[PDB]
Design a protein around this ligand. Sequence first.
Ligand SMILES: *Cc1c(COP(=O)(O)O)cnc(C)c1O
Ligand SMILES: [K+]
Length: 431
Amino acid sequence: QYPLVKDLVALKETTWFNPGTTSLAEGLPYVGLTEQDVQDAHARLSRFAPYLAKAFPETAATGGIIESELVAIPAMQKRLEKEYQQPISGQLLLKKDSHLPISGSIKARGGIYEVLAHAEKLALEAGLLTLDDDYSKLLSPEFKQFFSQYSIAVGSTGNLGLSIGIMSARIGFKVTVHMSADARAWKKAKLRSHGVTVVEYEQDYGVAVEEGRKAAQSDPNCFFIDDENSRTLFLGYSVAGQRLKAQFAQQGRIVDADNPLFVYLPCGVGGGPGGVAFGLKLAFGDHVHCFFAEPTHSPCMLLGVHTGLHDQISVQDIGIDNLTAADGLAVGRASGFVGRAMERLLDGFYTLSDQTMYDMLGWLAQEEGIRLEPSALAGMAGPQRVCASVSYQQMHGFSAEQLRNTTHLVWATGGGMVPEEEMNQYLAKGR
Ligand SMILES: *Cc1c(COP(=O)(O)O)cnc(C)c1O
Ligand SMILES: [K+]
């Protein structure tokens, strides 16, 4: 076998288990954020819940908590064991962030949160709002006019654009989304139907984000959503940790030393999976084990963490084209901060090809009736990478029994809003 980086260079599916993981206590100083920060995010989303229930009536029945289902997928589990000839110990579950309301992706967590935090900040500073107000008052025509004086910009592939576009437009902000090549036509149409300005290019994610950042700095009433650097996005994602813990409790599922939880997180820039992993660590401690999953054509986070260069190296530095069917994950350079903040708290990083993603996407639809976009399948290959590795199991001291009592949680990150035509194209690609 090649050394790891040569696998990367060759676009071979590969797996790196992190030999420098630490206890939660030993890792926490390096995060730069705390459980108090995470609880402040929960509290902010709770303050906005009465606004959201009215602004987006699809959330009224939970109102307006933005949360997704946690489901068991034992038919898919058996299918994976059949197709890849590797047993999956324990139970396989799926977290359906693909089916979050409003924008149908994990970006409905961090993207939406960042937009709400920005509105709140402006409204507070204007003297228009206090923390103990009923936030549904923000729906008033006066508030919409207030927010119309401010603009938001974002670069995206873009579930992020979709999330920040739809939320910002509903609030009353002017919003422009700078879209990478190609970004799906349906997403641009969807944004334009919400009164969002979209600016189309023909370079990748990093260029779109760069040009979007440039345009927002030209105006003190324009706020750039910076997915490479925003801790606010990260915190919006991290809210998922306690939400999941509460679901596990409700469902009567134990997470402890004897019943470990392994979580498999698709990774673009790292804010999404990093933020979720942080919230998970605070919720479950040393008993949750987190794995990032990237396309073979975009292994930016694995590359950054493995080499210790983080955002100082890109996939293109190693001759990789950053072209993948997994749009949400087609990020060529890791986060400005997530790798350093989180490496001690991440058990491993792996890559999988577009074809693997497409094959699994079809199997999931066949076995479970759940239809996702290719990006959302990246975690699905994780349980078998982990179960096959004797060295990973020995590294962490996992017994046969602990492995039988493991929960494997695949984090689905997008797909619920993909139109039938595009979904049928996805299904046509798998074998
Ligand atoms: C945002 C996104 C991810 C993870 O993205 P990050 O850039 O790491 O935050 C994964 N899957 C989908 C479908 C996404 O939209
Ligand atoms: K990536």
